[PDB]
Structures are given as structure tokens and as C-alpha cells.
């Protein structure tokens with residue numbers, strides 16, 4: 182059975198993931214950011230609506246409950262392309278193919294972002310701005326797809342000042358340079374990194390909730406000590422406790438790697454290739470699995486990629 | 488090797504589903520209620536009053552399509568979370584099919600009030616059909632529909648419209664208001680779901696039948712859920728569904744293909760719907776469980792869900 186290697190380039194925006202990922206491409210397909218869906222197919226300038234609303238909230242022109250609706254709905258438009266792609270690609274994914282110290286894959290897929298970014302990370306960041314309710318965030322987490330084998334997540338490490346410099350240059354249409362959002366999102370990713378490691382080292386959130394591997398205070402679980410989620414006595418409602426169970430299960434089998442972005446696109450692209458050797462690949466489930474994938478990828482890039 | 492039996496009583500609101508379910512449980516059996524408490528206090532405040540009010544405002548002409556849709560799609564993610572987690576926490580326990588149609592009796596029977604697709608597809612569609620939501624968003628939800636676990640027996644129910652209406656005109660749901668337009672929309676939507684499931688089981692293909700827009704003969708695609716997704720919005724100038732939307736429909740057929748749909752007529756006495764549903768139950772697929780200790784676990788979380796989100 183042929184082997185596939187999927188790589189999800191993910192992390193906060195404005196670090197040049199794209200600029201480097203293209204330089205890697207132009208055995209390998211690259212699934213681009215679904216801009217056309219965000220700007221036209223799914224709605225109409227979602228990115229702008231998102232940033233405006235936060236801004237209008239940031240100025241008091243509208244309420245935090247009103248901003249919450251709009252913020253939650255948009256996130257539904259922002260993450261769909263990732264959901265369909267994962268639901269359709271899941272049947273073809275077999276099981277771990279003795280990753281590392283193995284052979285070179287028949288096909289490498291570089292996705293631009295994983296469904297958790299739109300389902301977990303950004304909404305988390307949006308709550309942290311007072312635009313999203315923690316209940317709504319937990320609603321998206323409950324809907325997070327089971328973790329297929331070989332999910333390699335590449336997150337980025339960039340110094341603030343440098344991320345503030347690149348960010349400014351690469352502004353999506355309708356996007357405003359919200360530095361707080363920049364800060365909330367990098368925190369979220371930092372914690373996401375810590376969580377997967379906390380989990381992979383045997384961490385039980387339920388055991389530590391009363392507050393080697395990271396300490397729970399340094400994991401996504403910290404944000405769930407929100408007054409809205411607890412009973413009149415502080416007991417986490419079970420509905421939310423269970424969602425957390427799901428979160429914990431989804432993340433621990435994820436394979437995460439770090440790409441130092443503080444460098445030239447050549448450097449970035451070079452490194453990204455390096456990381457590829459420690460990555461987990463998988464056996465396609467069938468002969469026609471490979472070519473079927475290629476077309477999902479190409480048909481995607483072609484229709485949504487902007 | 489113990490076996491589990493799961494039954495999801497779905498269908499439109501106002502037919503007497505809760506009662507029959509309550510009755511059936513009174514005759515082991517575990518009942519997973521309607522997380523009403525999550526719907527009006529825990530998850531968001533008085534979500535039902537919102538849904539119904541907002542559609543009303545939309546209808547009266549005090550709200551615009553975008554304004555309402557934005558409000559309706561948030562309300563839906565809220566309404567569905569309980570079912571979503573329940574499914575995900577249940578999931579790791581469900582094992583392979585076992586069978587009931589002339590097979591032994593389960594160790595546990597879970598009667599769930601509704602199924603996730605209620606929140607993630609039927610109602611959303613009805614609202615799209617009401618103009619308070621968009622096909623794209625309905626499709627976004629469809630993409631998030633959890634994978635179907637084996638032995639998912641879905642009981643849908645019937646009642647003539649006229650009796651459905653008087654039945655609705657009576658027992659007042661907190662926050663609801665007799666929106667007859669919605670009632671019919673919801674009935675068509677669950678009608679099509681029955682057909683879709685049957686359409687897909689009779690070998691039918693949507694792509695193969697796109698150009699045309701068992702428990703009886705094979706249904707005309709135009710009688711299945713798919714017929715709802717022929718809206719300009721989802722159309723490429725080439726006349727075909729943009730792939731995005733077309734892949735959403737591929738999942739909708741993967742999800743509904745392995746469900747076991749059963750119809751229970753609610754045009755009868757409560758004791759009878761009970762007995763009637765007690766009958767359908769004889770030939771409902773069973774599943775084994777993965778860890779023997781799944782029975783106690785499944786049993787306790789079913790009770791926890793009830794004590795925290797029920798009745799309200």
C-alpha cells in the first residue's frame with residue numbers, strides 16, 4: 182500500500198508561512214488558504230466582517246453580545262473548507278506507516294492550516310477578546326473531527342517585533358492590524374503547543390483541575406476556568422467537562438513540529454523540508470486513493486485558492 | 488460480550504415524542520432527555536425565545552436576512568452542542584453490529600430524545616427554507632455532522648398535519664409561538680430525510696441524478712434532501728455546484744447512508760404509541776460495546792446528562 186505524508190502548516194497569521202510554503206512548491210501537492218471562499222463563496226468578505234466587528238466592539242459602537250453572534254457565525258464560514266476537506270479525505274487515510282527510518286512517500290500534502298485553527302485556536306483567541314462566549318468555543322470543540330493518523334502540525338516561532346513587522350506587510354483584505362489579537366493568538370498557540378506536550382507526557386486535566394511535562398496553568402485548560410462554565414459552586418458543568426475530554430483526546434495524538442520563522446524564505450523553506458524526516462506518514466487505504474487525493478487538492482486550489 | 492441498543496426518537500416538535508418515550512421507559516432502559524437547561528440557561532439565555540422571536544421579527548419586517556441568519560446560525564450551534572459531545576463521548580464505546588431481528592435482548596437500551604442531525608441538519612434546513620439561514624451555513628453544519636456510529640436507529644414519526652397543528656396549538660413550549668409556516672417546513676424537511684436515507688440505500692446517486700432537478704420503491708432525487716441545494720448561491724456560472732458545496736453533499740450521503748430509519752405513527756393514544764414503538768424496537772440493530780465497563784460508563788453519563796440538562 183502506497184504511503185502519504187500530510188503536513189499542516191499552521192500557526193498565527195503574519196509570519197510568512199505562505200510565502201515560504203509556496204517557495205517549497207511553486208510527490209508534493211499544496212492546498213492553499215481558501216480565500217475565495219472567505220471572500221465570496223461562503224459569504225462576502227468574512228475577514229473584513231470579523232475585524233470590523235471586533236473594532237466596533239473595541240469602540241463601544243455595539244454590544245459584546247451582538248458582537249458574539251456575528252463572531253460565532255463568521256467562524257462557521259471561516260472553517261468549513263477545512264471540514265469538508267477532512268471529511269472527504271478521511272476515508273483514504275489508512276494507518277501509521279512505520280514513520281521515520283522508513284521510505285520516501287508516494288505523495289506529500291501541505292495543507293495551509295488544520296481544522297483546529299478555525300475550530301479551536303481562533304475562537305479561543307476571539308473569546309479572549311470578549312467577542313466570543315466560552316460556551317460557543319466549547320461548541321466548536323465538541324464538533325472537532327476525530328484525529329486521523331499522521332497529523333503533523335507545524336507551528337511557527339517568531340519574535341514579536343519581527344512578527345509585528347512581517348504582519349504589517351502581509352495584510353489580508355479587510356484585515357486591521359489588531360496587535361491585541363496578535364497577542365491573544367500567539368498565546369493561544371503557545372498554550373496549544375504546551376497542551377499537546379502536557380498530554381503526550383501523561384497529563385490528566387481532571388487530576389490537575391484543582392489548580393516531566395508542562396503545568397496545567399500553561400495549557401488550554403486554563404482558559405476554561407470561566408465564570409460562565411461553572412455551577413453556582415464552581416463545579417465545572419459536566420457538559421463542559423466532557424467537551425474538555427474531547428479536546429484532550431483530539432490533541433494528544435497530533436504530531437507537532439516547530440519552524441523557526443526568524444529568517445529568509447529560503448531558510449524557512451529549507452527548514453520545513455528538514456522537519457519532514459521525523460514526520461509520520463500513512464498508508465493510503467486503496468490504489469485509487471492517491472490520484473483521488475490529488476484532484477481534491479487541485480480542484481480545491483483552483484476553486485478556492487486565491 | 489454485552490450488547491447495547493440505541494434509539495433516537497426524532498421528528499418534528501409537537502407530536503408527543505417525549506411522552507411516549509417517558510411511557511416506554513416506565514415499563515435495562517435509560518433515557519437521555521432534551522437538554523432544555525442547556526438551551527435556556529447553561530449554553531445561552533432563553534435560546535428558544537430567540538429563535539422564534541427573531542424569525543418573527545424577520546417575518547414582520549423589522550429584521551433583514553443577514554441580521555436574522557447571523558442570529559439563527561449562532562442559535563443552532565448552541566442548540567446542538569449537548570448532542571454533539573454526547574455522541575463524541577459515547578463514540579469510543581460503540582462496537583460492531585450484532586443485530587436484533589431474531590437476536591438476543593440488549594443489556595442496555597438508550598432512548599435519546601433527538602439525534603445530532605436534528606440540530607446539525609433538519610432544523611437548520613427548515614430555517615434555510617424559512618429564509619432565516621443560508622444554504623452555505625446549512626452545508627457548513629453538514630460538514631461537521633459527526634461520523635455515523637453503527638446501529639444508529641432513528642425513529643421518525645408521523646401525524647396528519649391537521650392533528651399535528653391542534654397538537655401544537657396546545658402544549659406551550661417556553662419561548663415558542665405557533666409559527667405554522669415553520670411547522671410545515673419542519674415536516675417537509677423530515678419527510679425528505681426519510682426519503683434521502685431510502686434513496687441512498689436503494690443504490691441512488693445524486694451526481695448521477697443531479698440533472699433531474701426497500702421501504703417502498705426508489706425515490707426520485709427530487710424527493711430527497713439534496714433537492715434543497717439547487718440555489719443560485721451554490722451555483723457556479725458553469726451551472727454546476729461549486730465543488731465545495733458538492734463535497735458537502737457527498738458527506739451528507741455518507742452520513743445518512745448507514746442510518747436505520749423507522750416510522751412511528753403518533754396519530755393514536757399515548758399508551759398505543761408506546762406499545763407501537765415497543766414493537767418497532769424488535770427489529771432495531773444492536774451493537775456490541777468495546778470495554779465491558781462501557782455499560783456502567785454509558786449508563787452513568789446518561790444519568791448525568793439527565794440530572795443537569797433535562798426538563799426545564
Ligand SMILES: Nc1nc2c(ncn2COC(CO)CO)c(=O)[nH]1
Pocket residue numbers: 194228231256259260298299303304307353356
Ligand atoms: N478562523 C478565524 N481566522 C481568523 C480570525 N481572525 C483572523 N483570522 C485568520 O487570519 C486571517 C488574516 O487576519 C487569514 O490568515 C477569526 O476570527 N477566525
Ligand SMILES: Nc1nc2c(ncn2COC(CO)CO)c(=O)[nH]1
Pocket residue numbers: 500521535538563566567605606610611614660663
Ligand atoms: N435546533 C433548533 N431547534 C428548534 C428550532 N425551533 C424549534 N426547535 C426545537 O423545538 C423546541 C421547541 O419548538 C424544542 O426542541 C430551531 O430553529 N432550531
